[PDB]
Amino acid sequence: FTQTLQKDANASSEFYINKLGQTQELEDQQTYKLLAARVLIRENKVEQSAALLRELGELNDAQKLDRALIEARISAAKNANEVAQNQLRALDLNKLSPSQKSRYYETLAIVAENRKDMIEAVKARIEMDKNLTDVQRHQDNIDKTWALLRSANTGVINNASDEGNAALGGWLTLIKAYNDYIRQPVQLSQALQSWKNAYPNHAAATLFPKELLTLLNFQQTNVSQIGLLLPLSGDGQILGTTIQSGFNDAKGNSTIPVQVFDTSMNSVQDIIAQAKQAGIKTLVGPLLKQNLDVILADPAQIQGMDVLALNATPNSRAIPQLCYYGLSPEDEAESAANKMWNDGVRNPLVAMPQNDLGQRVGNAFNVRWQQLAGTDANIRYYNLPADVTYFVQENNSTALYAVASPTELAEMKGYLTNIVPNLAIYASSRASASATNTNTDFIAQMNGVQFSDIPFFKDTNSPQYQKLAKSTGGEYQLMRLYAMGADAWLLINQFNELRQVPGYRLSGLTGILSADTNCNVERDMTWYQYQDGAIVPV
Numbered sequence: 001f002t003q004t005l006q007k008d009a010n011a012s013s014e015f016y017i018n019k020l021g022q023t024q025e026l027e028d029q030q031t032y033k034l035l036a037a038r039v040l041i042r043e044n045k046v047e048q049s050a051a052l053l054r055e056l057g058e059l060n061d062a063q064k065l066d067r068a069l070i071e072a073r074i075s076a077a078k079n080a081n082e083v084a085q086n087q088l089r090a091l092d093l094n095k096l097s098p099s100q101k102s103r104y105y106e107t108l109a110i111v112a113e114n115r116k117d118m119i120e121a122v123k124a125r126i127e128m129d130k131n132l133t134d135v136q137r138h139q140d141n142i143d144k145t146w147a148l149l150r151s152a153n154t155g156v157i158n159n160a161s162d163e164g165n166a167a168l169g170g171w172l173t174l175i176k177a178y179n180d181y182i183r184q185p186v187q188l189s190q191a192l193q194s195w196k197n198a199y200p201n202h203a204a205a206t207l208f209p210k211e212l213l214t215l216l217n218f219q220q221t222n223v224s225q226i227g228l229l230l231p232l233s234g235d236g237q238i239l240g241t242t243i244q245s246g247f248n249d250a251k252g253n254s255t256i257p258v259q260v261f262d263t264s265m266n267s268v269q270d271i272i273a274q275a276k277q278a279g280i281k282t283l284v285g286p287l288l289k290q291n292l293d294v295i296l297a298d299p300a301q302i303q304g305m306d307v308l309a310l311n312a313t314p315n316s317r318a319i320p321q322l323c324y325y326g327l328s329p330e331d332e333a334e335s336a337a338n339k340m341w342n343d344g345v346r347n348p349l350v351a352m353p354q355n356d357l358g359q360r361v362g363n364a365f366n367v368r369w370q371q372l373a374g375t376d377a378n379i380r381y382y383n384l385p386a387d388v389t390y391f392v393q394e395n396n397s398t399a400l401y402a403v404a405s406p407t408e409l410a411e412m413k414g415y416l417t418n419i420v421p422n423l424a425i426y427a428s429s430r431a432s433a434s435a436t437n438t439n440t441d442f443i444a445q446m447n448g449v450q451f452s453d454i455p456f457f458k459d460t461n462s463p464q465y466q467k468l469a470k471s472t473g474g475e476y477q478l479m480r481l482y483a484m485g486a487d488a489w490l491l492i493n494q495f496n497e498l499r500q501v502p503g504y505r506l507s508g509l510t511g512i513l514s515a516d517t518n519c520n521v522e523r524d525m526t527w528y529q530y531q532d533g534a535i536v537p538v
């Protein structure tokens with residue numbers, strides 16, 4: 001049974017540990033412990049793997065050989081590169097099975113990657129590939145190899161020879177094509193299609209890297225007419241009208257015809273049917289969450305159409321040719337988690353209103369905080385500003401993120417500074433309004449607080465700002481919606497890049513725009529802090 005070690009381990013570590021109770025044959029026990037230890041690494045559990053190796057008892061030669069492989073991988077994971085390399089070179093490569101050789105070369109690749117030697121890491125993964133048999137493992141190594149090449153600096157790539165190594169030659173041409181043409185994705189598509197015919201026996205010609213799949217058959221954005229879905233009468237009229245103005249101002253003299261569909265006068269399902277009958281293949285909108293959910297209730301309704309929805313809901317998911325562009329507080333909370341991390345905040349307090357909005361935004365913050373910190377944030381819900389008094393204690397260290405009005409946040413800062421006067425406070429754009437941000441007192445009172453908002457608020461002297469501030473009556477909320485409409489024009493004209501070019505970024509009035517894997521539009525916010533009675537960008 002010891003021969004199992006020479007084969008891929010396809011089960012979970014749990015599965016292998018269970019087999020210990022089912023078996024009382026002492027030699028089989030060690031084998032199962034080695035199998036669990038091996039998998040435990042790929043589950044990113046180095047210490048658990050190391051602990052299990054210490055539980056091993058008497059081992060035959062084959063079991064000792066496999067333990068030494070795992071030990072080398074653990075050393076590589078711990079960045080003990082010299083030790084790991086010495087450990088591998090102490091093994092007899094000719095005694096290893098193909099599966100064991102694949103593990104050997106992956107460890108070598110990790111060592112090289114630790115050392116920032118990308119070409120050497122790629123060469124080790126090329127050797128790993130020769131020994132792999134399973135398709136998913138083939139694909140995973142292809143994707144890791146591509147990621148190594150993408151991280152290499154262009155100088156090393158452009159000067160590297162293939163060394164007579166056909167696999168390396170194909171890889172080098174592929175990354176050069178990417179680096180040379182990613183800015184011209186139509187030309188990159190042509191180069192990638194050529195690459196498949198130039199290296200048809202290359203491993204990646206059959207299993208293309210996942211990051212390149214949308215580029216291989218890229219299609220240029222070519223908008224011919226747009227249907228604009230907004231609430232333009234009744235309730236929500238101000239919202240849609242303002243978004244429409246930003247949209248139309250950005251559109252300027254474009255000859256692209258835009259047909260306007262007032263969602264307050266007709267159901268979205270009828271509107272989409274109308275647009276299809278009229279031959280419209282491009283929609284901007286709808287805005288209201290419930291109207292987006294109509295689309296998501298039967299996504300085939302928009303088959304053949306590119307759609308930039310102006311909201312996102314808990315039901316948003318990867319749907320062909322559908323992208324989601326909202327100004328959600330959930331996404332500002334994510335920007336808050338990132339900022340507080342990079343600010344060096346640890347153990348953050350998150351004060352949310354006690355309502356569904358609070359849960360969603362608090363949950364959004366915590367999800368992101370777990371990613372950056374590997375632990376939970378302290379989310380707490382309030383009904384009144386006063387409630388935050390009991391969120392902190394005298395002997396804390398810590399920092400706060402709050403979603404609340406400018407007045408409510410003012411009151412909060414008063415209650416919290418009596419318990420911890422040096423508390424770093426963070427807030428969302430809901431805390432920034434014109435009346436308060438121009439008052440000498442509110443600005444010295446809120447001195448210290450920093451908040452996220454759109455970059456449009458950087459230049460409060462320019463003409464575009466002055467004109468909009470006047471036309472909106474100084475209401476920051478409406479200025480944000482105007483900017484959203486302008487950015488919607490930007491996005492719909494870069495729709496295929498947004499969908500198909502990984503990492504594509506746009507400078508918008510509402511922030512730096514990019515798209516996640518569901519084509520939800522992410523926004524890199526501007527942060528502002530009150531300083532010397534003045535508001536300065538950070």
Ligand SMILES: [Cl-]
Pocket residue numbers: 229230231263285286287288291
């Ligand atoms: Cl709508």
